[PDB]
Ligand binder design. Structure first.
Ligand code: MG
Ligand code: MN
Ligand code: MN
Lengths: 509, 508
């Protein structure tokens, strides 16, 4: 039994938001507004990333609705609200039995003046596998039409060919394209020169050569240290003219100091979560970041009293999600050794428990680090982090070392995600694959070296629409066709649950 | 429960501040701190980290498994905060182990680690005031048993209640840390009572005493990063003593505040091990290392060894699940209500025990208003207890400020509020509010000088003989001092010793 969640007591101020500028003057004017803003701007990750990291993405539309309008009116200073993409699309269907499209429509109505930001995985939009180009373009068209205003487009290997088409589609739909560099490694560690400052500079130059409106720096594992953050942001600001959007996780406890370091260097936007859903593997707290910068040269653009009022509601509704809580959470600097993103951390822990190795999770994480080194020190983020996690699980579960796969390897049946990674299905890693180990991994199957979307089976939306209309009881909308293409079986199971249980999204949590 | 993981250390064998103290004395330690370019770290894992997170319930049995690893694997530590605070009372009352026994065992296990204790000035580890000779005897015995650093503070930042303790610590050849409790916001012009000049003058006065180190205690984590930089700078250009900053991470800004203070030139900062850090506890030691890694000043610590130690601490924290606070998020409302973490938890518990937990929000608002009504006082033990009790009283019987100011001449205010307004805790900065004080005491004697002057005299010979009667043997000096500080608690501990024996030897 729970009391009603506390409702915020706001002090409303009418301002013109970035969403209003986008609606009236387009993406370039929004870019100018961000460029002309002296304060650092904030993107609230509460609706997507905060509960993806802390609550296994299980946060429901019903709890979102009770506070969405309060966020829209009480925090008009926000650059945007990250409310879509990531694991939310799949999790909604699969586990919450609510449509991500329905969530987007309801929030869009409730939040007219808030810019809606989505995490978009480049060639595999919200999936884990590459889709043909027209599928990606159609997804982007529907997402922009239904109210996504900002597309943070990233590729799990920082491979620009996998991002170009999505960036172009976002621009063609009159929305804001965020081209993302995934940060990994340590630019201040000379012993690790692969992802050095020059690598990021060149990548940022290439991304700016695209039409991307904003350059995002995505630190999926909270690897960006404060001095590293200041240096990287400074070098990027000297290399390109796009506004910078930094996104970090607080898993090592250094999120606030990293954000302040980037703010000194001139970052434009930083990703924050509400205090009650912040810290740990989630983003740094928005209230905390306000007080960190309060009397410095640059302030955080936010109504902190209103944010503290909103946080009471978020604190109350988090209690509904006790079964999905991770547990005791402390700052964890081991993330600097094993570069596992939080989602990869929890999923790997769960899989090790199901496998029956939870007592050896320490050497599981060591295997993760060594597997990453064996694959060639790859950027570990969805879905590339799944590859490393699966390989490490496989190598501990059958007691393999590096030499075991390098000499005995030709006999083992490596997990399919490792195989798919080494066939080039995820794209091309920086510096290419390790040729010998690639030969061991893919014994005989075909290996591609170009954009996997080129080799994607063609999809025609008319036949898919007719077939879906047969499979479900009615004529599907464009969003439903796009969902069926991305997650075929998941969408059908969701339709089955809709026919059998109805809109359970209306139930209170 | 699995056996806690033991650290795999890489030992370096360097000379520590404890060695300098043992061979060359406190002044040489101060010079060593002054000459150190890096920021030095004080580990609060053994006292403050588990006082904040585990209700001070961490037992000697768990400390023993890792004490030597801390001593050898982290020789760079300036000191380990392992005594004082609520630990002294809690050990006896709830853990049924002697704080003196803990100190002796840890001292043996940690020969090269400087032991730091939180000392409450006029009170040693109690909540009331004690006569001067009792405080001096406590300091003598604590220094003899192995306490090397005494962080001496007074709950109202009143120097007369710290002078005697500082002098006794110096006379015993140990390091005296004179402490300013931080409160308010030195960068908020609308709250001028505790401005930068107040702290500067207090620091000058403290340096006039023989204090070796000036400590800035931010019991509630109120010190914001820009404020931290500015305050440490102004203090650094005011006095010559090294600065020792201690903050809590309640608002989520502990690390950034420490980095700001490191920029301003703070010499020592208080950190907890990662597994017992964050939230209402201190910022993480590993986190503070990686925060400063490539800046002008590094943190002096073997971070690999610290990360190894943290595995053990993480494992043993699981034994203390019944004492956990719960889901912990950064909380910037501490800037409004300046509750210290311990005051926060105890106030929550008391409100629940009287059926008011559903309105803890207005309870905290009452706490803030009560603080403003008492005159914006420094809220730390035991002064924070006074504000907490008054706020509980006013919500529980539905009073406002007008109620106590007009109708208040007939209610029975709680005794700790009465004791505070009688001057038993000392004299607040700016004095008491005249009308409220009269309404509060209503008949009783109000003193304006050091309460220890009017403390009933204590003679250790008669106390020792009486204690030897009450227990079955002749007590040591530490046992006499404990009996004077906590008479009933010590006797109940002796009863439990006679009945159950040394339960401290059991695993948690
Ligand atoms: Mg700007
Ligand atoms: Mn993220
Ligand atoms: Mn403290």
């Amino acid at each position: 039994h729970f009391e009603e969640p506390r409702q915020p007591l706001l002090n409303l101020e009418k301002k013109k938001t970035a969403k209003n500028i986008l609606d009236e003057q387009g993406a370039d004017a929004v870019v100018d507004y961000v460029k002309n803003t002296k304060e650092v701007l904030l993107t609230d990750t509460t609706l997507r990333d905060a509960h993806q990291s802390l609550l296994a993405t299980r946060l429901r539309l019903q709890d979102m609705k009770g506070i969405a309008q309060a966020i829209d009116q009480g925090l008009p200073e926000l650059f945007s609200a990250e409310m879509w993409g990531g694991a939310t699309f799949d999790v909604a269907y699969r586990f919450l039995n609510e449509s991500p499209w329905y969530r987007l429509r309801k929030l869009r109505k409730l939040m007219p003046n808030t810019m809606f930001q989505m995490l978009f995985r480049g060639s595999n939009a919200v999936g884990y596998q590459n889709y043909p180009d027209n599928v990606i373009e159609e997804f982007i068209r529907v997402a922009a039409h239904e109210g996504i205003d900002v597309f943070r487009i990233f590729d799990s290997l920082n491979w620009l060919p996998q991002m170009e088409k999505s960036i172009q589609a976002v621009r063609d739909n009159g929305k804001i394209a965020e081209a993302t560099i995934c940060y990994t490694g340590d630019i201040l560690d000379p012993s690790r020169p692969k992802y050095n400052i020059q690598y990021y500079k060149d990548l940022a130059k290439e991304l700016e050569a695209t039409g991307a409106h904003i350059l995002a720096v995505k630190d999926m594992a909270g690897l960006l240290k404060p001095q590293a953050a200041y240096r990287l942001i400074s070098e990027l600001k000297d290399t390109v003219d796009l506004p910078i959007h930094l996104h970090t996780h607080d898993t090592s406890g250094n999120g606030i100091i990293t954000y302040s370091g980037a703010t000194q260097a001139g970052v434009d936007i930083i990703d924050v979560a509400t205090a009650s859903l912040a810290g740990g593997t989630s983003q740094p707290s928005m209230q905390s970041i306000y007080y960190a910068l309060e009397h410095g040269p640059r302030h955080a653009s936010i109504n902190v009293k209103n944010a503290e009022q909103i946080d009471h509601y978020w604190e109350d509704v988090r209690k509904y999600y006790a079964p999905f809580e991770a547990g005791i959470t402390s700052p964890q600097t081991e993330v600097y050794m094993h570069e596992m993103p939080g989602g990869q951390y929890t999923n790997l822990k769960s899989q090790a428990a199901a496998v029956g190795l939870g007592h050896r999770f320490d050497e599981i994480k060591q295997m993760y680090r060594k597997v990453n080194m064996m694959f060639g020190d790859i950027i570990k983020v969805t879905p590339s982090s799944k590859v490393v996690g699966d390989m490490a699980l496989f190598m501990i579960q059958n007691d393999l070392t590096e030499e075991d796969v390098y000499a005995r390897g030709n006999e083992l049946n490596f997990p399919e995600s490792v195989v798919s990674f080494f066939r080039g299905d995820l794209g091309q890693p920086v510096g290419g694959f390790p040729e010998k180990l690639q030969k061991i991994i893919v014994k005989d199957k075909a290996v591609i070296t170009d954009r996997p979307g080129l080799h994607a089976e063609k999809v025609d939306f008319e036949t898919v629409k007719a077939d879906l209309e047969q499979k479900i009881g009615y004529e599907p909308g464009d969003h439903e066709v796009i969902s069926y293409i991305m997650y075929p079986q998941v969408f059908l199971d969701y339709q089955k649950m809709q026919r059998e249980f109805g809109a359970v999204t209306l139930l209170d949590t």
